[PDB]
Structure formats: C-alpha cells, structure tokens
C-alpha cells in the first residue's frame, strides 16, 4: 500500500469533470416516403436513447468521484431500456412525395454533429488514466472501474460515428433516387401529350410504362435500403 491522499482527490474531481454535451439537432425526414419518414425516426430514437445513456455514464462517473472521496476518507479515519425500432405506389405520387421536404438538409447537419461528438469523447479519456502514486488492491480495483469507463466511452464514440454514418448513408440514398425516379414534371408533361394527341398514344405509352417500372425499382431500394438498425448501446 502506497497512499497519495491528495492524489485520489484530484483525480475524483477530474473523472466527474463535465463532459462535453450530446448534440441536440433533430434528424428530419428528406421527403415524404414513409421509408423516409421511417428512417428519421429511427435516428430520433437511436439518437434520444444514446443521450439516456450518455446520461446515466455521468452517473457512474459521479458514482466513481464518489467512491475514490471514500477510499480517501477511509485512510484518514485509520489514520436504461432499448431503442424502439421503427416498423418498416402511382409514379406521380411517389415523384411528389420524393421532391417534397428538404432534401436531406437535416440529416447531413445531425451526422456532422455526432461525428464530432465522437472525436471529443475520444479526446476525454486521459481522466481515465492509472495512479501514479496509489498503490494497492483498492488502487487496483479503482483502476479496474476507470478503464471500465474508458472502454464505454470509447464505444459510446463509435455509436455515435455509426449513428452518424447512417444519416449521411440515408442523405446519399436520397441524392440517388432524385437522380433516378422519373421527375413529376416528366412524367405530367408525358401523360400530357398523350391526353391530347390521340394518334402519339400507342407510341407513348412503353415510355411511360418504362418511367413506372423504375419509379418501382427506386421505391424497392429506398424502401430496403433506408431501413435503420436501432443503435443499442451498452449500461455504464
Ligand atoms: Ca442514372
């Protein structure tokens, strides 16, 4: 037993130091798809469920303070649930479902927001370090406890990256269907001509058929791809 009262003192004040907090931006749908809306709100309860937790590490990081307060004391005397997942079409319609709301704008702020959230976690665990001057089993114990900490944090930094990551994933699975369903305005300007030029109808009409059948395959990968794992992030 070696013993640095001063020591575990200081290091009770430094692991329950406030951390930085969560961001806060909530994740809006890009458009009007339920595959869109769905995914939004996947990351509204992923994202709420890691605040919970993120939360109740604070907790155990004052629960800690806490502990190393009484080890210090003792000498002188001598002397959580998880996230809910989210239950996962006419060409006009899903033309103007895509082209209304915006775009994906939100989901790129969220993911910019958790990403550097991620890089400030992994920058705070220098709190969770060994004892320079502290010696012993309860040293030991104690020091078993922080790394325990350092290990969620750092997990909790990879959550919040993979969170992030599925926001832009849903952005960029956006961006691909704008670039590949037919428009609203193609596809009216199509039915259109065919309305009034009755001799243009039979000859119209493959291309049209052509426009459904990848407003179909679109809607297809859109509806799969933006299906969101819940995030589930482990008990500190
Ligand atoms: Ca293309």
Same mark, same amino acid.
């Given at each position: 037993v070696?013993?640095?009262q +001063?020591?575990?003192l200081?290091?009770?004040?430094?692991?329950?130091?406030?951390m930085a907090?969560?961001?806060?931006?909530v994740?809006?749908?890009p458009?009007?798809?339920?595959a869109?809306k769905?995914?939004?709100q996947? *990351?509204? *309860?992923?994202?709420?469920? /890691?605040?919970?937790?993120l939360?109740a590490?604070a907790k155990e990081?004052?629960?800690?303070?806490t502990?190393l307060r009484?080890?210090?004391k003792?000498?002188?005397?001598?002397?959580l649930t998880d996230?809910?997942?989210?239950?996962?079409?006419? *060409?006009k319609?899903?033309?103007r479902?895509?082209?209304?709301g915006?775009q994906?704008?939100?989901? %790129?702020?969220?993911?910019?927001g958790?990403?550097t959230?991620?890089?400030?976690l992994?920058?705070?665990?220098?709190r969770?370090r060994?004892?320079?001057?502290?010696?012993?089993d309860?040293?030991? %114990?104690?020091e078993?406890?922080?790394?325990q900490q350092?290990?969620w944090?750092?997990?909790?930094?990879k *959550?919040?990256?993979? /969170? %992030?990551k +599925?926001?832009?994933?849903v952005?960029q699975?956006?961006?691909? %269907?704008?670039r590949?369903?037919?428009?609203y305005?193609d596809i009216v300007?199509?039915?259109?001509?065919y309305?009034?030029?009755?001799?243009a109808?039979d000859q119209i009409?493959?291309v049209?058929?052509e426009? +459904?059948?990848?407003?179909?395959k679109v809607?297809?990968?859109?509806?799969?791809?933006?299906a969101?794992?819940?995030?589930?992030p482990?008990?500190?």
């Open positions: 070696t013993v640095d +001063q020591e575990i200081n290091r009770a004040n430094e692991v329950e130091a406030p907090d969560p961001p806060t931006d994740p809006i749908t458009c009007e798809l339920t869109a769905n995914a939004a996947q *990351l509204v *309860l992923s994202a709420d469920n /890691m605040r919970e937790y939360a590490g990081r004052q629960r800690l303070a502990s009484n080890a210090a003792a000498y002188g005397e001598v002397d996230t809910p997942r989210v239950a996962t079409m006419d *060409l319609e899903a033309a479902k895509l082209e209304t915006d994906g704008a939100s989901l %790129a702020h969220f993911a910019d958790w990403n959230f991620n890089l400030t992994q920058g705070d665990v220098k969770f060994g004892f320079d001057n502290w010696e012993g309860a040293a030991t %114990a104690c078993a406890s922080l790394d350092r290990q944090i750092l997990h909790m930094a *959550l919040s990256a993979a /969170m %992030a +599925q926001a832009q994933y952005a699975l956006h961006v691909w %269907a704008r590949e369903h037919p428009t305005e300007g199509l039915e259109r001509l309305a009034e030029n009755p001799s109808r009409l493959p049209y058929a426009y +459904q059948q990848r407003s179909e809607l297809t990968e859109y509806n799969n791809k933006a969101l794992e819940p995030v589930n482990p008990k500190p």
